[PDB]
From a paper:
The obtained crystals were subjected to X-ray diffraction experiments and X-ray crystal structures were obtained for M. tb EgtD with HD2, HD3, and HD6. The chemical structure of HD6 is very similar to that of HD2, so the interactions between EgtD and HD6 are nearly identical to those with HD2. The only difference observed is a rotamer change in the side chain of Glu282 resulting in slight reorientation of the carboxylate moiety. However, the presence of a hydrogen atom on the α-amino moiety of HD6 now affords a bidentate interaction between Asn166 and HD6, which is more similar to the interaction between EgtD and the L-Histidine substrate. First, HD2, HD3, and HD6 most closely resemble a Histidine amino acid as they all possess α-amino and α-carboxyl moieties, but the α-amino group is elaborated with a variety of chemical linkages. The reason for the 1.5–2.5-fold decrease in the HD6 inhibitory activity versus HD2 and HD3 is less clear but is likely derived from steric hindrance between the cyclopentene and the narrow constriction separating the Histidine and AdoMet binding sites. The observed crystal structures of EgtD-Histidine-/Histamine-derivative complexes, consistent with the changes observed upon L-Histidine binding to EgtD, exhibit only minor variation in the side chain rotamers of residues forming the substrate binding sites.
Numbering used by the authors: 1 to 321
Write the structure that this text describes.
Amino acid sequence: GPVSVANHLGEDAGHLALRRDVYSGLQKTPKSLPPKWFYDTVGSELFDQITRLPEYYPTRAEAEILRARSAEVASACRADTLVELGSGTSEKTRMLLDALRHRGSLRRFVPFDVDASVLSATATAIQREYSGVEINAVCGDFEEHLTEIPRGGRRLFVFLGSTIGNLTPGPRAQFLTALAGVMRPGDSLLLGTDLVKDAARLVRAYDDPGGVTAQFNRNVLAVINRELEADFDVDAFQHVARWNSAEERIEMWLRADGRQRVRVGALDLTVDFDAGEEMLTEVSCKFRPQAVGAELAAAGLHRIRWWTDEAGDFGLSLAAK
Ligand SMILES: O=C(N[C@@H](Cc1c[nH]cn1)C(=O)O)C1CC=CC1
């Protein structure tokens, strides 16, 4: 079937976004950086490695649920269109496409993400693997472009991996409200959320002993050095994963080993790190089952299915507009 890729991001959008995120985040107290910048080519291969670590249970936990429940997802939502908020590159994408195809209802695949080159490769791959399916890839961001997702048919929106945990409660409610606003009655959302559990298991999932996650975290400094002509001493920053018991969220920090003075040339900006000062690079909010249903309802959606894996480590919600 035919492929389309519609690009709503200017060629310079990513660079300007990085400039302003860094300019603002390095002047906060504490300093912080959005986690979107982990995912350059190096960071993405490091993330792929993380998903295979025994300590990082979310990937396999969600896959276990999806292998058991994708058929029920397909029959409950009756969708003819799969909208992925993501790049379409995973085995989980195929699990869901296969389930819709097995019902004979798969007409359209809409991968929605910020990298047109990844989206292009996905569209080609899906076109080869799924005859009779139209692929309408959309290059855009959550803030501006959810309305650019093609209309019509009965759409299952998918946002897996507990990526929604990267949004603190305020922005998370704003995002779910915006998403539900582009959803039509009869459309569905399948949402993955990692669950509150033993704090040590949570910290261990974000600090594997071989230091893959540590490398992934520090890599945001390499990205800033390379893209904005900065001089972070990348090795003088230590990876710290913290469980925030009050907000029930994992936090990833980078901790300065000794005082540091960093000049970001492309921004004409100098910042200081005190010895032992920590900079926040990612929050990973963890959820309770009832609370996810309540957040969906607050956005105008109605949860009709909740599933966990056999250990209760991870949850999937199916919600209808
Ligand atoms: O992948 C995401 N979140 C993961 C990231 C991760 C895994 N190990 C360490 N960090 C999580 O919180 O588990 C989302 C946010 C942006 C792109 C997808």
